[PDB]
Amino acid sequence: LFPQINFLGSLLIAGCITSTDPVLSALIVG
């Protein structure tokens, strides 16, 4: 099994993949 810090851990990595911002930000739009 994976650790409990997997969620927060994937957040740091996913951050690079994102580059922009959460999908929610797209809903609010500039």
Side-chain angles (χ1 to χ4, degrees):
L1 281 291
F2 5 103
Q4 16 173 276
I5 333 192
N6 71 295
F7 230 76
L8 254 59
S10 88
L11 230 305
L12 258 292
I13 313 183
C16 322
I17 282 166
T18 302
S19 218
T20 65
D21 4 65
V23 272
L24 249 60
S25 224
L27 230 181
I28 317 186
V29 189

PDB file of all heavy atoms in Angstrom:
ATOM      1  N   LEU A   1       0.831  -1.198   0.000  1.00  0.00           N
ATOM      2  CA  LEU A   1       0.000   0.000   0.000  1.00  0.00           C
ATOM      3  C   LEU A   1       0.869   1.253   0.000  1.00  0.00           C
ATOM      4  O   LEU A   1       2.070   1.187   0.259  1.00  0.00           O
ATOM      5  CB  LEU A   1      -0.908   0.006   1.236  1.00  0.00           C
ATOM      6  CG  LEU A   1      -2.111  -0.918   1.006  1.00  0.00           C
ATOM      7  CD1 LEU A   1      -3.053  -0.323  -0.049  1.00  0.00           C
ATOM      8  CD2 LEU A   1      -1.615  -2.284   0.527  1.00  0.00           C
ATOM      9  N   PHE A   2       0.254   2.394  -0.293  1.00  0.00           N
ATOM     10  CA  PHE A   2       0.982   3.657  -0.325  1.00  0.00           C
ATOM     11  C   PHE A   2       0.843   4.386   1.011  1.00  0.00           C
ATOM     12  O   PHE A   2      -0.046   4.079   1.804  1.00  0.00           O
ATOM     13  CB  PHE A   2       0.442   4.539  -1.451  1.00  0.00           C
ATOM     14  CG  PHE A   2      -0.755   3.872  -2.086  1.00  0.00           C
ATOM     15  CD1 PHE A   2      -2.046   4.322  -1.787  1.00  0.00           C
ATOM     16  CD2 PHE A   2      -0.572   2.804  -2.972  1.00  0.00           C
ATOM     17  CE1 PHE A   2      -3.156   3.701  -2.376  1.00  0.00           C
ATOM     18  CE2 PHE A   2      -1.682   2.184  -3.560  1.00  0.00           C
ATOM     19  CZ  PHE A   2      -2.972   2.633  -3.261  1.00  0.00           C
ATOM     20  N   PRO A   3       1.701   5.340   1.268  1.00  0.00           N
ATOM     21  CA  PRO A   3       1.670   6.127   2.537  1.00  0.00           C
ATOM     22  C   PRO A   3       0.459   7.053   2.607  1.00  0.00           C
ATOM     23  O   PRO A   3      -0.290   7.187   1.640  1.00  0.00           O
ATOM     24  CB  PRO A   3       2.971   6.931   2.504  1.00  0.00           C
ATOM     25  CG  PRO A   3       3.341   7.028   1.060  1.00  0.00           C
ATOM     26  CD  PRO A   3       2.793   5.775   0.383  1.00  0.00           C
ATOM     27  N   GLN A   4       0.274   7.692   3.758  1.00  0.00           N
ATOM     28  CA  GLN A   4      -0.849   8.604   3.944  1.00  0.00           C
ATOM     29  C   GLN A   4      -0.534   9.970   3.343  1.00  0.00           C
ATOM     30  O   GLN A   4      -1.437  10.727   2.991  1.00  0.00           O
ATOM     31  CB  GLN A   4      -1.156   8.758   5.436  1.00  0.00           C
ATOM     32  CG  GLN A   4       0.026   8.240   6.256  1.00  0.00           C
ATOM     33  CD  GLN A   4      -0.188   8.552   7.734  1.00  0.00           C
ATOM     34  OE1 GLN A   4       0.122   9.653   8.188  1.00  0.00           O
ATOM     35  NE2 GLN A   4      -0.706   7.642   8.515  1.00  0.00           N
ATOM     36  N   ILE A   5       0.755  10.277   3.229  1.00  0.00           N
ATOM     37  CA  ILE A   5       1.178  11.556   2.669  1.00  0.00           C
ATOM     38  C   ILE A   5       1.237  11.480   1.147  1.00  0.00           C
ATOM     39  O   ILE A   5       1.889  12.300   0.501  1.00  0.00           O
ATOM     40  CB  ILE A   5       2.554  11.936   3.217  1.00  0.00           C
ATOM     41  CG1 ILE A   5       2.747  11.298   4.595  1.00  0.00           C
ATOM     42  CG2 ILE A   5       2.651  13.457   3.342  1.00  0.00           C
ATOM     43  CD1 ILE A   5       3.976  11.908   5.273  1.00  0.00           C
ATOM     44  N   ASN A   6       0.552  10.492   0.580  1.00  0.00           N
ATOM     45  CA  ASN A   6       0.533  10.319  -0.867  1.00  0.00           C
ATOM     46  C   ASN A   6      -0.226  11.463  -1.533  1.00  0.00           C
ATOM     47  O   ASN A   6       0.194  11.980  -2.568  1.00  0.00           O
ATOM     48  CB  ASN A   6      -0.127   8.987  -1.225  1.00  0.00           C
ATOM     49  CG  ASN A   6      -1.626   9.058  -0.950  1.00  0.00           C
ATOM     50  OD1 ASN A   6      -2.041   9.192   0.200  1.00  0.00           O
ATOM     51  ND2 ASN A   6      -2.466   8.974  -1.944  1.00  0.00           N
ATOM     52  N   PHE A   7      -1.347  11.851  -0.933  1.00  0.00           N
ATOM     53  CA  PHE A   7      -2.157  12.935  -1.477  1.00  0.00           C
ATOM     54  C   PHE A   7      -1.356  14.232  -1.523  1.00  0.00           C
ATOM     55  O   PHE A   7      -1.183  14.829  -2.586  1.00  0.00           O
ATOM     56  CB  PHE A   7      -3.406  13.134  -0.619  1.00  0.00           C
ATOM     57  CG  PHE A   7      -4.627  13.163  -1.505  1.00  0.00           C
ATOM     58  CD1 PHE A   7      -5.140  11.971  -2.032  1.00  0.00           C
ATOM     59  CD2 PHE A   7      -5.250  14.383  -1.800  1.00  0.00           C
ATOM     60  CE1 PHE A   7      -6.272  11.999  -2.855  1.00  0.00           C
ATOM     61  CE2 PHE A   7      -6.382  14.410  -2.623  1.00  0.00           C
ATOM     62  CZ  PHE A   7      -6.893  13.219  -3.150  1.00  0.00           C
ATOM     63  N   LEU A   8      -0.870  14.663  -0.363  1.00  0.00           N
ATOM     64  CA  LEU A   8      -0.090  15.892  -0.283  1.00  0.00           C
ATOM     65  C   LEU A   8       1.187  15.770  -1.108  1.00  0.00           C
ATOM     66  O   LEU A   8       1.649  16.747  -1.701  1.00  0.00           O
ATOM     67  CB  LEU A   8       0.270  16.187   1.174  1.00  0.00           C
ATOM     68  CG  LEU A   8      -0.589  17.345   1.687  1.00  0.00           C
ATOM     69  CD1 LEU A   8      -2.069  16.977   1.565  1.00  0.00           C
ATOM     70  CD2 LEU A   8      -0.253  17.617   3.155  1.00  0.00           C
ATOM     71  N   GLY A   9       1.751  14.568  -1.144  1.00  0.00           N
ATOM     72  CA  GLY A   9       2.976  14.332  -1.901  1.00  0.00           C
ATOM     73  C   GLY A   9       2.738  14.523  -3.394  1.00  0.00           C
ATOM     74  O   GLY A   9       3.533  15.163  -4.082  1.00  0.00           O
ATOM     75  N   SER A  10       1.640  13.963  -3.890  1.00  0.00           N
ATOM     76  CA  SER A  10       1.307  14.079  -5.306  1.00  0.00           C
ATOM     77  C   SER A  10       0.976  15.523  -5.663  1.00  0.00           C
ATOM     78  O   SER A  10       1.030  15.913  -6.829  1.00  0.00           O
ATOM     79  CB  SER A  10       0.113  13.183  -5.636  1.00  0.00           C
ATOM     80  OG  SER A  10      -1.090  13.909  -5.419  1.00  0.00           O
ATOM     81  N   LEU A  11       0.634  16.314  -4.650  1.00  0.00           N
ATOM     82  CA  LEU A  11       0.296  17.716  -4.869  1.00  0.00           C
ATOM     83  C   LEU A  11       1.521  18.491  -5.350  1.00  0.00           C
ATOM     84  O   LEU A  11       1.433  19.297  -6.275  1.00  0.00           O
ATOM     85  CB  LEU A  11      -0.227  18.337  -3.568  1.00  0.00           C
ATOM     86  CG  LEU A  11      -1.548  19.073  -3.818  1.00  0.00           C
ATOM     87  CD1 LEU A  11      -1.365  20.109  -4.931  1.00  0.00           C
ATOM     88  CD2 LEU A  11      -2.629  18.067  -4.227  1.00  0.00           C
ATOM     89  N   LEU A  12       2.660  18.238  -4.715  1.00  0.00           N
ATOM     90  CA  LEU A  12       3.897  18.916  -5.085  1.00  0.00           C
ATOM     91  C   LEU A  12       4.308  18.539  -6.506  1.00  0.00           C
ATOM     92  O   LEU A  12       4.687  19.398  -7.302  1.00  0.00           O
ATOM     93  CB  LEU A  12       5.016  18.535  -4.110  1.00  0.00           C
ATOM     94  CG  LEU A  12       5.238  19.664  -3.095  1.00  0.00           C
ATOM     95  CD1 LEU A  12       5.828  20.892  -3.794  1.00  0.00           C
ATOM     96  CD2 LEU A  12       3.902  20.040  -2.446  1.00  0.00           C
ATOM     97  N   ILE A  13       4.229  17.249  -6.815  1.00  0.00           N
ATOM     98  CA  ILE A  13       4.597  16.768  -8.143  1.00  0.00           C
ATOM     99  C   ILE A  13       3.602  17.269  -9.187  1.00  0.00           C
ATOM    100  O   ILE A  13       3.994  17.829 -10.210  1.00  0.00           O
ATOM    101  CB  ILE A  13       4.626  15.240  -8.154  1.00  0.00           C
ATOM    102  CG1 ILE A  13       5.386  14.736  -6.925  1.00  0.00           C
ATOM    103  CG2 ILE A  13       5.329  14.752  -9.422  1.00  0.00           C
ATOM    104  CD1 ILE A  13       5.485  13.211  -6.974  1.00  0.00           C
ATOM    105  N   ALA A  14       2.317  17.060  -8.920  1.00  0.00           N
ATOM    106  CA  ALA A  14       1.276  17.495  -9.845  1.00  0.00           C
ATOM    107  C   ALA A  14       1.396  18.990 -10.124  1.00  0.00           C
ATOM    108  O   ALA A  14       1.033  19.462 -11.201  1.00  0.00           O
ATOM    109  CB  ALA A  14      -0.104  17.194  -9.256  1.00  0.00           C
ATOM    110  N   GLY A  15       1.910  19.730  -9.147  1.00  0.00           N
ATOM    111  CA  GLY A  15       2.073  21.170  -9.297  1.00  0.00           C
ATOM    112  C   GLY A  15       2.826  21.501 -10.582  1.00  0.00           C
ATOM    113  O   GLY A  15       2.461  22.428 -11.305  1.00  0.00           O
ATOM    114  N   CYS A  16       3.877  20.737 -10.858  1.00  0.00           N
ATOM    115  CA  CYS A  16       4.676  20.958 -12.058  1.00  0.00           C
ATOM    116  C   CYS A  16       3.853  20.669 -13.310  1.00  0.00           C
ATOM    117  O   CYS A  16       3.922  21.406 -14.293  1.00  0.00           O
ATOM    118  CB  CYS A  16       5.911  20.057 -12.037  1.00  0.00           C
ATOM    119  SG  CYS A  16       6.545  19.941 -10.346  1.00  0.00           S
ATOM    120  N   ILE A  17       3.077  19.591 -13.265  1.00  0.00           N
ATOM    121  CA  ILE A  17       2.246  19.213 -14.401  1.00  0.00           C
ATOM    122  C   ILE A  17       1.188  20.279 -14.670  1.00  0.00           C
ATOM    123  O   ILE A  17       0.887  20.593 -15.821  1.00  0.00           O
ATOM    124  CB  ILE A  17       1.562  17.873 -14.126  1.00  0.00           C
ATOM    125  CG1 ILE A  17       2.562  16.737 -14.353  1.00  0.00           C
ATOM    126  CG2 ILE A  17       0.374  17.701 -15.073  1.00  0.00           C
ATOM    127  CD1 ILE A  17       2.006  15.441 -13.757  1.00  0.00           C
ATOM    128  N   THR A  18       0.629  20.833 -13.599  1.00  0.00           N
ATOM    129  CA  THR A  18      -0.393  21.864 -13.731  1.00  0.00           C
ATOM    130  C   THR A  18       0.163  23.081 -14.462  1.00  0.00           C
ATOM    131  O   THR A  18      -0.284  23.417 -15.559  1.00  0.00           O
ATOM    132  CB  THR A  18      -0.897  22.284 -12.347  1.00  0.00           C
ATOM    133  OG1 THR A  18      -1.407  21.143 -11.667  1.00  0.00           O
ATOM    134  CG2 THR A  18      -2.001  23.330 -12.497  1.00  0.00           C
ATOM    135  N   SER A  19       1.139  23.740 -13.846  1.00  0.00           N
ATOM    136  CA  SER A  19       1.750  24.920 -14.447  1.00  0.00           C
ATOM    137  C   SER A  19       0.810  26.117 -14.352  1.00  0.00           C
ATOM    138  O   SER A  19       1.249  27.248 -14.145  1.00  0.00           O
ATOM    139  CB  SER A  19       2.081  24.645 -15.915  1.00  0.00           C
ATOM    140  OG  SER A  19       3.320  25.262 -16.240  1.00  0.00           O
ATOM    141  N   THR A  20      -0.485  25.861 -14.503  1.00  0.00           N
ATOM    142  CA  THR A  20      -1.478  26.926 -14.431  1.00  0.00           C
ATOM    143  C   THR A  20      -2.102  26.984 -13.041  1.00  0.00           C
ATOM    144  O   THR A  20      -1.459  27.406 -12.079  1.00  0.00           O
ATOM    145  CB  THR A  20      -2.573  26.691 -15.474  1.00  0.00           C
ATOM    146  OG1 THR A  20      -3.274  25.495 -15.162  1.00  0.00           O
ATOM    147  CG2 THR A  20      -1.941  26.565 -16.861  1.00  0.00           C
ATOM    148  N   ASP A  21      -3.357  26.560 -12.942  1.00  0.00           N
ATOM    149  CA  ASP A  21      -4.058  26.568 -11.663  1.00  0.00           C
ATOM    150  C   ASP A  21      -5.200  25.554 -11.674  1.00  0.00           C
ATOM    151  O   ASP A  21      -5.624  25.097 -12.734  1.00  0.00           O
ATOM    152  CB  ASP A  21      -4.616  27.965 -11.385  1.00  0.00           C
ATOM    153  CG  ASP A  21      -4.338  28.883 -12.573  1.00  0.00           C
ATOM    154  OD1 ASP A  21      -4.881  28.626 -13.634  1.00  0.00           O
ATOM    155  OD2 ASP A  21      -3.587  29.828 -12.402  1.00  0.00           O
ATOM    156  N   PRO A  22      -5.701  25.199 -10.518  1.00  0.00           N
ATOM    157  CA  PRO A  22      -6.816  24.222 -10.393  1.00  0.00           C
ATOM    158  C   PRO A  22      -7.857  24.389 -11.497  1.00  0.00           C
ATOM    159  O   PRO A  22      -7.932  25.438 -12.139  1.00  0.00           O
ATOM    160  CB  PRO A  22      -7.410  24.545  -9.024  1.00  0.00           C
ATOM    161  CG  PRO A  22      -6.281  25.103  -8.217  1.00  0.00           C
ATOM    162  CD  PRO A  22      -5.262  25.690  -9.202  1.00  0.00           C
ATOM    163  N   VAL A  23      -8.657  23.350 -11.710  1.00  0.00           N
ATOM    164  CA  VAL A  23      -9.691  23.395 -12.738  1.00  0.00           C
ATOM    165  C   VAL A  23     -10.822  24.330 -12.321  1.00  0.00           C
ATOM    166  O   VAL A  23     -11.603  24.787 -13.155  1.00  0.00           O
ATOM    167  CB  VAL A  23     -10.248  21.991 -12.979  1.00  0.00           C
ATOM    168  CG1 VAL A  23      -9.398  21.277 -14.030  1.00  0.00           C
ATOM    169  CG2 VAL A  23     -10.210  21.199 -11.671  1.00  0.00           C
ATOM    170  N   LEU A  24     -10.906  24.608 -11.023  1.00  0.00           N
ATOM    171  CA  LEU A  24     -11.946  25.488 -10.506  1.00  0.00           C
ATOM    172  C   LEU A  24     -11.708  26.925 -10.962  1.00  0.00           C
ATOM    173  O   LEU A  24     -12.651  27.648 -11.281  1.00  0.00           O
ATOM    174  CB  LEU A  24     -11.964  25.433  -8.977  1.00  0.00           C
ATOM    175  CG  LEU A  24     -13.239  24.731  -8.507  1.00  0.00           C
ATOM    176  CD1 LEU A  24     -13.272  23.307  -9.064  1.00  0.00           C
ATOM    177  CD2 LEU A  24     -13.255  24.680  -6.978  1.00  0.00           C
ATOM    178  N   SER A  25     -10.443  27.328 -10.993  1.00  0.00           N
ATOM    179  CA  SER A  25     -10.092  28.681 -11.413  1.00  0.00           C
ATOM    180  C   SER A  25     -10.647  28.970 -12.804  1.00  0.00           C
ATOM    181  O   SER A  25     -11.014  30.104 -13.114  1.00  0.00           O
ATOM    182  CB  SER A  25      -8.574  28.847 -11.422  1.00  0.00           C
ATOM    183  OG  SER A  25      -8.234  30.094 -10.828  1.00  0.00           O
ATOM    184  N   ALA A  26     -10.703  27.938 -13.640  1.00  0.00           N
ATOM    185  CA  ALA A  26     -11.214  28.092 -14.997  1.00  0.00           C
ATOM    186  C   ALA A  26     -12.700  28.437 -14.974  1.00  0.00           C
ATOM    187  O   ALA A  26     -13.199  29.135 -15.856  1.00  0.00           O
ATOM    188  CB  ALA A  26     -11.001  26.801 -15.786  1.00  0.00           C
ATOM    189  N   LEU A  27     -13.402  27.945 -13.959  1.00  0.00           N
ATOM    190  CA  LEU A  27     -14.830  28.207 -13.830  1.00  0.00           C
ATOM    191  C   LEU A  27     -15.076  29.670 -13.478  1.00  0.00           C
ATOM    192  O   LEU A  27     -15.981  30.306 -14.019  1.00  0.00           O
ATOM    193  CB  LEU A  27     -15.430  27.311 -12.747  1.00  0.00           C
ATOM    194  CG  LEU A  27     -16.680  26.616 -13.292  1.00  0.00           C
ATOM    195  CD1 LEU A  27     -17.301  25.746 -12.198  1.00  0.00           C
ATOM    196  CD2 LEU A  27     -17.694  27.669 -13.742  1.00  0.00           C
ATOM    197  N   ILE A  28     -14.265  30.197 -12.566  1.00  0.00           N
ATOM    198  CA  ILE A  28     -14.404  31.589 -12.149  1.00  0.00           C
ATOM    199  C   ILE A  28     -13.952  32.530 -13.260  1.00  0.00           C
ATOM    200  O   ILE A  28     -14.471  33.638 -13.397  1.00  0.00           O
ATOM    201  CB  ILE A  28     -13.569  31.842 -10.892  1.00  0.00           C
ATOM    202  CG1 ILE A  28     -13.744  30.672  -9.921  1.00  0.00           C
ATOM    203  CG2 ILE A  28     -14.036  33.134 -10.222  1.00  0.00           C
ATOM    204  CD1 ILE A  28     -13.029  30.988  -8.607  1.00  0.00           C
ATOM    205  N   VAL A  29     -12.984  32.082 -14.051  1.00  0.00           N
ATOM    206  CA  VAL A  29     -12.470  32.894 -15.148  1.00  0.00           C
ATOM    207  C   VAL A  29     -11.945  34.227 -14.628  1.00  0.00           C
ATOM    208  O   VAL A  29     -12.358  34.698 -13.568  1.00  0.00           O
ATOM    209  CB  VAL A  29     -13.576  33.145 -16.175  1.00  0.00           C
ATOM    210  CG1 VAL A  29     -12.977  33.792 -17.423  1.00  0.00           C
ATOM    211  CG2 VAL A  29     -14.230  31.814 -16.554  1.00  0.00           C
ATOM    212  N   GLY A  30     -11.029  34.831 -15.379  1.00  0.00           N
ATOM    213  CA  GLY A  30     -10.452  36.111 -14.982  1.00  0.00           C
ATOM    214  C   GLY A  30     -11.493  37.222 -15.061  1.00  0.00           C
ATOM    215  O   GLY A  30     -12.599  37.090 -14.541  1.00  0.00           O
TER     216      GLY A  30
END
